[PDB]
C-alpha cells in the first residue's frame, strides 16, 4: 500500500467542498496535491481529474461530454459531497482550481543582479532620440505633489536687508561670477553628453546665449 | 584637441577665457560604454584561461578538481588564481609569496561553511586550506544557460541589411575566479594587519571597506565582484527575524 | 490517463531546484507540484522517492527506515531523474524543501526561503571556526611551493573571440547564485547559522569599493 | 414555427460582423445572437457550424474533430451563407468572436474588444520583422523595374462626374476600417501582440501633421 | 443527437426562474441562448 486512501478522501472532500460552494477557510498545498492524488487513484472520478487538470495551462481541451457523461461526473461530485448542484457548480469550482494551480509555491532566494551604471551602447545618439528614451523613462516615474502655502510670489522689500547683501556682494566682480557660472554650467552639459553617449551640438549650445544681441541690437 | 569658451558681460569689452581640454570628456564617455567594461572584464578571464593554459591547465576545471589522487594540479591551480589576482592588485609583482604549503581538505568534519579557501600561520610557513567537495559542489552546479537577464532595434537593421571553451566552461572559470578573489582579500587583511584581524574579518566581512578603501581603492584596479551590485532575493523580508531599533552613528557601511 | 513526458519534466525542473542542484529561477506554481508528486506515484522505480515525500506531510512523521541496498537504488533513480555528485544529502535537501513547501499555505505570491532544518549540535560561526580549525591544522599539506603571464595578443584576441558571444551577466549570475547556495547548503549541513547580514554585507563591500 | 428567411438574414449580419468579413458597424443585439444560433440549429447543413459555435460555451472544451471533407463543406456552407476568400482562418476568427460574445455577461452598454485568441509562439513585433525579415530577402524578386501623369481636362472632368456622387467620407471609412481589421487580422493570426497604441500614434501623427 | 438537452433546460429554469420572480444573480448571453434554444426544441 502507497496511499492512505480514506485520509486522502477526507482532504478531497474538504479542499472541492470548500472550492466549489465556500467560493469566500485556509488550506494548504499539501491538500491539493492530496485532492489530485484522490481524483486520479478513484477509477470513477477521473473525468473530473481531467477537467482539472485542463486547468494546468491554456493548450489544453476536453472532448464534448454527452449526456450519460455529465450525469455521471454529476453524482460523483454530488458523492464526493446531498447538496443539489448542477453544470454551474462544476464551472466555478474548476475556475477556483484554475486559479489555485496557478499559484506560486516557495522558492529558495536568488541573488539578483543591478546594474551598476547606466552604461550606454556603442552606437551614437543624437538629443532627439535621448530625449524621447528619456522621457519615456521618466513617465514610469511616480511624481509627487507640492503644495505652496500661497499664491503669491515670495519677495522681499527689506531694504536694509537688500543694501546690506549688496554692500557684501560689492567686492564681487560681475564678470568672473557669470564666468565661473557659465563655465561651470557647460562643464556639467559636456560631461551629461559624454556620459549618455549624445553628440554635442556646439552650434546650438551657442544659440542659447545669443540673446545678448538680441537684446542689445534692439 | 582643446574647446575654448569666453564669457562677456554688458558692461565693458572684456572677455575672461577658458580652455578645455577634450580627453577628459572622452575617458568619461569610453568608461560610460556597456561594450568597454563587458571588454574589460571579459579581457581578464580570457588572461585568467591563457595563464592557466601555458601552466598546462587546458582541462576543465570542475574535471581537475575532481581529481581526489592528483593533489599538485588542484595546489598550482588555486596558487595560480591567487598570484593572478595580487598581480591585478599590484601591477609590479609577477611571482606570488615565494613559499607556501597547500592542504586539501575532502571532509564536512573539517570544513568551513562559506569559506572554502582559508589561510593559517604555522609558526614556520603560510598555509592554505582548500575544501575541494565544496568547489566540486560549486562547479557541478547546473547552471542557467537558456534565460536573458535584462538592442533589438539594431539586429532588425542588421537583418533588413581553437580551443572549444562552451558557456558552462567560461561560468565556471569565473566562478573560481571570484571564489579566489574572496579568498586573496582575506588573505590581503591577513597579510597586512596580523591574525587578529583576519579572524575578525572572518566573522564579520564589513571591515572589508576600511581595510581595502585606505590603499586600494586608490592604487589599485575594479574588483571582479563589482561588475554587479548583487542582493539577495526579498531580503528584508528574510532579515525581518532580526530588526534593530538602531541609531547608526558609525555607518561606515551603507 | 496522465502525460507521463510532461509530469516527468515538470518533476524534473521542481526538483532541480529543490536539490539546489541547479540555479535556473523559474517561478513555480502548485501546479508543479501535483505534476512531480503525480509522476513520482504513478513510476514504479520512484515509489521509494513518492513515499520519502509523501511522509513530510506531518512533522511528526519522520524519514522510513531504508537498508542500504534501498538507499543506493533510491540515489540511482534521483540520478537517472535528473540525468547528472548526488547523495544522502542531497536526498535531505530534497526532502527538506518538499516538507516545507508542503505544510506551506495556498498564497498568491512566492514565499522566499532559505535553507533550513537538515542534517543536533546547534553552533556559530566561530565556534566551527575554532573547532574545524584545528582538525585542519591536524592535517599535513600535500604540496610545497618555493610566474608566466603572457600577453599574446593574438592568443587574446582568440580567447575573447571564443568569449565575446556569452552574455557576461548570464555568467556573472551562474557564478553567484553558486556561491550563494554552496555557502547557503554548508552553513545547513553543519547546522550553523547563516548570517546573511555578512553576505549582504559583501555584496555593499563590493558596492563601497567600487565607487572609491 | 419561426420565420427562417428573418433568422437567416439575422445569422447572416452577425457572422459578417464576427467574420471581419465586412465593415457595416450595425449595433447588435442578444436577439440576433439568439436567431443566429436558432438559424443554424434548424438547417440541415448548417448543423457542423452550429455544433462548432455550441462547443464555445465552455472555454475547456475545445473544436470537434473534423475529416478534410467536413472541413471543405462546413467552407462551402459558410460561403453560400455569405454569398461572396473564405478559408479556415476565417472559421477561426468567428469561433473566438462566438466564444467571447457567448461567455459576456448580459450588460447595458455594447463592449467593445479587439480580436484574440486565434491560430504557440507568442512573439512582439521585432522579433517578427527580423525573422519573417529574412524569409522575405529570401525570395528573389519577380520583377525589374529600371511615368505618364496625364491631366486630360475632360478625362478628369467625367472622373469628376463619376466619383461626384460618392461620399467621400463613407469610402475613407470604409478603407480606414477596412486597413485597421487586416492590421488586426494579421496580428492576431501571426500571434503578435496588436500596440493600438502605434496604430493611434498614426493617426495622431497625420493629425499633427495637417496644421502645420 | 445535436442538444444536450438536460444541461439546457436546467440553464432555462435558472434564467426563467430568475427573470420572472427574482426581478432583483448574473447571466451571461449564453444562457439567453440556451434558454430560447429550450423553448424551441420543447
Same mark, same amino acid.
Given at each position: 500500500?502507497?496511499?492512505?486512501?480514506?485520509?486522502?478522501?477526507?482532504?478531497?472532500?474538504?479542499?472541492?467542498?470548500?472550492?466549489?460552494?465556500?467560493?469566500?477557510?485556509?488550506?494548504?498545498?499539501?491538500?491539493?496535491?492530496?485532492?489530485?492524488?484522490?481524483?486520479?487513484?478513484?477509477?470513477?472520478?477521473?473525468?473530473?481529474?481531467?477537467?482539472?487538470?485542463?486547468?494546468?495551462?491554456?493548450?489544453?481541451?476536453?472532448?464534448?461530454?454527452?449526456?450519460?457523461?455529465?450525469?455521471?461526473?454529476?453524482?460523483?461530485?454530488?458523492?464526493?459531497?446531498?447538496?443539489?448542484?448542477?453544470?454551474?457548480?462544476?464551472?466555478?469550482?474548476?475556475?477556483?482550481?484554475?486559479?489555485?494551480?496557478?499559484?506560486?509555491?516557495?522558492?529558495?532566494?536568488?541573488?539578483?543582479?543591478?546594474?551598476?551604471?547606466?552604461?550606454?551602447?556603442?552606437?551614437?545618439?543624437?538629443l532627439?532620440?535621448l530625449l524621447?528614451?528619456r522621457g519615456?523613462?521618466i513617465?514610469?516615474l511616480q511624481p509627487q505633489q507640492y503644495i505652496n502655502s500661497g499664491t503669491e510670489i515670495p519677495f522681499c522689500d527689506d531694504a536694509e536687508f537688500l543694501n546690506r547683501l549688496l554692500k557684501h556682494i560689492d567686492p564681487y566682480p560681475l564678470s568672473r561670477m557669470y564666468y565661473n557660472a557659465a563655465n561651470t554650467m557647460f562643464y556639467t552639459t559636456m560631461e551629461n553628453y559624454a556620459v549618455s553617449?549624445c553628440?554635442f551640438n556646439i552650434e546650438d549650445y551657442n544659440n542659447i546665449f545669443k540673446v545678448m544681441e538680441n537684446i542689445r541690437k534692439h | 584637441?582643446k574647446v575654448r569658451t569666453v564669457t562677456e558681460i554688458v558692461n565693458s569689452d572684456e572677455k575672461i577665457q577658458k580652455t578645455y581640454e577634450?580627453?577628459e570628456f572622452?575617458?568619461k564617455?569610453?568608461?560610460?560604454?556597456?561594450?568597454?567594461?563587458?571588454?574589460?572584464?571579459?579581457?581578464?578571464?580570457?588572461?585568467?584561461?591563457?595563464?592557466?593554459?601555458?601552466?598546462?591547465?587546458?582541462?576543465?576545471?570542475?574535471?581537475?578538481?575532481? %581529481?581526489?589522487?592528483?593533489?599538485?594540479?588542484?595546489?598550482?591551480?588555486?596558487?595560480?588564481?591567487?598570484?593572478?589576482?595580487?598581480?591585478?592588485?599590484?601591477?609590479?609583482?609577477?611571482?606570488?609569496? %615565494?613559499?607556501?604549503?597547500?592542504?586539501?581538505?575532502?571532509?564536512?568534519?573539517?570544513?568551513?561553511?562559506?569559506?572554502?579557501?582559508?589561510?593559517?600561520?604555522?609558526?614556520?610557513?603560510?598555509?592554505?586550506?582548500?575544501?575541494?567537495?565544496?568547489?566540486?559542489?560549486?562547479?557541478?552546479?547546473?547552471?542557467?544557460?537558456?534565460?536573458?537577464?535584462?538592442?533589438?532595434?539594431?539586429?532588425?537593421?542588421?537583418?533588413?541589411?581553437?580551443?572549444?571553451?562552451?558557456?558552462?566552461?567560461?561560468?565556471?572559470?569565473?566562478?573560481?575566479?571570484?571564489?579566489?578573489?574572496?579568498?586573496?582579500?582575506?588573505?590581503?587583511?591577513?597579510?597586512?594587519?596580523?591574525?587578529?584581524?583576519?579572524?575578525?574579518?572572518?566573522?564579520?566581512?564589513?571591515?572589508?571597506?576600511?581595510?581595502?578603501?585606505?590603499?586600494?581603492?586608490?592604487?589599485?584596479?575594479?574588483?571582479?565582484?563589482?561588475?554587479?551590485?548583487?542582493?539577495?532575493?526579498?531580503?528584508?523580508?528574510? %532579515?525581518? %527575524?532580526?530588526?534593530?531599533?538602531?541609531?547608526?552613528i558609525?555607518?561606515?557601511?551603507?
Amino acid at each position: 500500500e502507497l496511499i492512505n486512501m480514506r485520509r486522502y478522501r477526507n482532504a478531497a472532500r474538504k479542499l472541492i467542498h470548500h472550492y466549489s460552494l465556500n467560493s469566500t477557510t485556509e488550506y494548504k498545498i499539501s491538500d491539493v496535491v492530496m485532492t489530485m492524488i484522490f481524483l486520479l487513484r478513484s477509477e470513477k472520478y477521473h473525468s473530473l481529474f481531467k477537467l482539472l487538470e485542463t486547468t494546468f495551462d491554456d493548450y489544453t481541451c476536453r472532448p464534448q461530454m454527452t449526456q450519460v457523461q455529465t450525469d455521471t461526473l454529476l453524482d460523483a461530485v454530488r458523492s464526493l459531497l446531498s447538496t443539489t448542484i448542477d453544470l454551474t457548480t462544476v464551472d466555478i469550482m474548476r475556475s477556483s482550481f484554475a486559479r489555485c494551480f496557478n499559484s506560486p509555491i516557495m522558492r529558495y532566494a536568488k541573488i539578483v543582479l543591478l546594474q551598476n551604471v547606466a552604461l550606454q551602447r556603442d552606437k551614437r545618439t543624437t538629443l532627439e532620440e535621448l530625449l524621447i528614451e528619456r522621457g519615456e523613462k521618466i513617465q514610469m516615474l511616480q511624481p509627487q505633489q507640492y503644495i505652496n502655502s500661497g499664491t503669491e510670489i515670495p519677495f522681499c522689500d527689506d531694504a536694509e536687508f537688500l543694501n546690506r547683501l549688496l554692500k557684501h556682494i560689492d567686492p564681487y566682480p560681475l564678470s568672473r561670477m557669470y564666468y565661473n557660472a557659465a563655465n561651470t554650467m557647460f562643464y556639467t552639459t559636456m560631461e551629461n553628453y559624454a556620459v549618455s553617449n549624445c553628440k554635442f551640438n556646439i552650434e546650438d549650445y551657442n544659440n542659447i546665449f545669443k540673446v545678448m544681441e538680441n537684446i542689445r541690437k534692439h | 584637441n582643446k574647446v575654448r569658451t569666453v564669457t562677456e558681460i554688458v558692461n565693458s569689452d572684456e572677455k575672461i577665457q577658458k580652455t578645455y581640454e577634450l580627453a577628459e570628456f572622452d575617458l568619461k564617455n569610453l568608461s560610460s560604454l556597456e561594450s568597454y567594461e563587458t571588454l574589460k572584464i571579459k579581457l581578464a578571464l580570457s588572461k585568467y584561461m591563457a595563464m592557466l593554459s601555458t601552466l598546462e591547465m587546458t582541462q576543465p576545471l570542475l574535471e581537475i578538481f575532481r %581529481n581526489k589522487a592528483d593533489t599538485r594540479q588542484i595546489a598550482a591551480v588555486v596558487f595560480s588564481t591567487l598570484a593572478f589576482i595580487h598581480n591585478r592588485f599590484h601591477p609590479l609583482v609577477t611571482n606570488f609569496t %615565494n613559499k607556501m604549503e597547500f592542504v586539501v581538505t575532502e571532509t564536512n568534519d573539517t570544513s568551513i561553511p562559506g569559506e572554502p579557501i582559508l589561510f593559517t600561520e604555522n609558526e614556520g610557513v603560510l598555509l592554505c586550506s582548500v575544501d575541494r567537495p565544496s568547489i566540486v559542489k560549486m562547479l557541478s552546479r547546473e547552471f542557467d544557460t537558456e534565460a536573458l537577464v535584462n538592442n533589438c532595434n539594431v539586429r532588425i537593421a542588421k537583418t533588413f541589411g581553437d580551443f572549444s571553451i562552451t558557456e558552462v566552461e567560461a561560468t565556471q572559470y569565473l566562478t573560481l575566479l571570484l571564489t579566489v578573489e574572496h579568498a586573496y582579500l582575506h588573505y590581503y587583511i591577513f597579510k597586512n594587519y596580523g591574525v587578529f584581524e583576519y579572524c575578525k574579518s572572518l566573522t564579520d566581512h564589513s571591515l572589508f571597506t576600511n581595510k581595502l578603501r585606505s590603499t586600494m581603492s586608490t592604487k589599485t584596479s575594479n574588483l571582479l565582484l563589482s561588475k554587479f551590485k548583487f542582493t539577495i532575493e526579498d531580503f528584508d523580508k528574510i %532579515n525581518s %527575524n532580526s530588526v534593530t531599533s538602531g541609531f547608526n552613528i558609525y555607518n561606515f557601511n551603507k
